[PDB]
């Protein structure tokens, strides 16, 4: 797990393109040293350990680029989560007021998120296998398994977007229309974090009210995703942030 | 910063962005174009009908956020703008909602959009004093006439050597 | 020894830091390049014998 955070700058901003050449060369010569040009305008590096980062900057200042460069102090990359279920709802409706989405949030258990990380629950299965896995091990509902749509951040993200509101759920025309954008916005909110722009982990969101504009056309199709992630944030921030 | 003018470098209560990317507070950019038709972002003069208006959203806090994502727009958040619709939705919002899909429509309304109508507006990753004086100067310019004594009194010769080893003279160099 | 050679910064902003354990010269010498800007004419000595 790469966890250490190091921001770097040249002393005179003039030679920043050369500093960029150097950060290229280290990124190419190192396996998992990961650099990012962060929205604050900065250049952050994410790494493993003290000796690791030491020899990193040793080569950076020694070989690749010979500017003088300032270096901030080490810090961590963070995670976000909840402690208990979103006791109420804020529900987001598209810019053109066409789709009302009610969803809430709560905590999963650690183990199943661990399995999500283990690739043990690979949804590359059929929903049937999903159900076997889930109900078998952790007394999940079979219908909860039917309700699990996806996993958030990326291929392996420890959170789960679930859809459980039966009579409006059998609107498989409009919902089975909207699942794609729904998942886009979900993984959006999960990756970009509701509080501090770091990853969320091990959290369960449940869709309980999907009032879809009939023919959820490009109006929905386009103006649906920020609405979805705002639903995500509403649930989370409403009833219980945690670090 | 984000929502301040640039020629004033102060806040703009009503904005009108530049077709190039900055904030040209129309209230004074119209004074700038009505007194010297040029632009402060670029000293070259730029036409009038290009200064379109902009829409910075606002939350329960009033802050000039992005409407779509509900994301507060400050000096870090990437801001795109959609020209034809009149609305500005966050650059990440517009990007992942239209640069993944092929619905190149507006970001607030039901309107289409042009694949170049979105431009980056903010991205940190890129003497009458008294009667004594009046009557004095009257009588002076009246009764006062030109002067007499100090009027008159204001090898080589040696003015060079003199004026050189003496600062109390006007310098000849020849 | 006598010192070898002889304004504003942002990473030193006191509102953005978290001091949980305060840096000391032992650290600045253990990791010359991580814990020091402009580390010049430096030997990086380490031993896990």
């Amino acid at each position: 797990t790469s966890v250490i955070k190091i921001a770097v700058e040249p002393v005179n901003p003039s030679e920043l393109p050369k500093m960029l050449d150097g950060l290229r060369k280290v990124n190419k010569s190192y396996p998992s040293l990961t650099t990012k040009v962060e929205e604050s305008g900065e250049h952050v590096i994410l790494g493993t350990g003290e000796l690791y980062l030491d020899c990193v900057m040793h080569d950076l200042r020694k070989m690749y680029s010979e500017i003088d460069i300032k270096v901030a102090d080490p810090v961590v990359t963070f995670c976000e989560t909840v402690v208990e279920t979103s006791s109420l709802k804020c529900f987001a409706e598209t810019p053109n007021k066409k789709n009302k989405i009610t969803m809430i949030a709560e905590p999963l258990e650690k183990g199943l998120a661990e399995d999500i990380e283990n690739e043990v629950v690979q949804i590359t299965w059929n929903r049937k296998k999903l159900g076997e896995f889930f109900q078998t091990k952790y007394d999940w509902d079979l219908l909860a398994a039917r309700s699990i749509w996806a996993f958030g951040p990326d291929a392996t993200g420890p959170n789960i977007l679930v859809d459980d509101t039966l009579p409006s759920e059998v609107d498989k025309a409009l919902l089975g229309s909207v699942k794609d954008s729904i998942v886009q916005g979900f993984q959006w909110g999960t990756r970009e974090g509701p509080l501090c722009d770091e990853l969320i982990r091990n959290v369960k969101f449940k869709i309980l009210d999907a009032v879809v504009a009939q023919e959820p056309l490009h109006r929905g199709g386009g103006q649906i995703i920020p609405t979805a992630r705002r639903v995500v944030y509403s649930a989370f921030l409403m009833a219980t942030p945690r670090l | 910063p984000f929502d301040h003018c640039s020629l004033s470098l102060q806040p703009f209560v009503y904005p009108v962005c530049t077709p190039d990317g900055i904030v040209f507070d129309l209230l004074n950019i119209v004074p700038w174009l009505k007194k010297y038709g040029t632009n402060p972002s670029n000293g070259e003069k730029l036409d009038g009908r290009s200064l379109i208006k902009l829409n910075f959203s606002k939350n329960s806090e009033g802050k000039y956020h992005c409407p779509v994502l509900f994301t507060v727009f400050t000096n870090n958040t990437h801001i795109v703008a959609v020209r034809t619709t009149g609305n500005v939705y966050a650059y990440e919002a517009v990007e992942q909602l239209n640069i993944k899909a092929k619905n190149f429509r507006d970001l607030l309304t039901d309107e289409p959009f042009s694949r170049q109508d979105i431009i980056t507006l903010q991205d940190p990753t890129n003497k009458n004093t008294n009667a004594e004086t009046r009557e004095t100067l009257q009588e002076l310019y009246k009764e006062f006439k030109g002067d007499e004594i100090l009027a008159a009194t204001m090898y080589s010769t040696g003015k060079v050597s003199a004026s050189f080893t003496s600062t109390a003279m006007v310098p000849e160099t020849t | 020894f006598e010192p070898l050679v002889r304004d504003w910064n942002e990473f030193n902003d006191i509102n953005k830091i978290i001091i949980r354990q305060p840096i000391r010269t032992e650290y600045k010498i253990a990791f010359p390049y991580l814990y020091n800007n402009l580390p010049h004419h430096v030997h990086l000595t380490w031993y896990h014998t």
């Binding site: 929205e39 963070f78 509080l195 501090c196 722009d197 670090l243 | 958040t77 | 953005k16």
Partner: peptide
Amino acid sequence: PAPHLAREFMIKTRRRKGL
């Protein structure tokens, strides 16, 4: 002290990044 580690953590992390 411990009651406020995440409070600060957020304040300083956003102060750098989140605004």
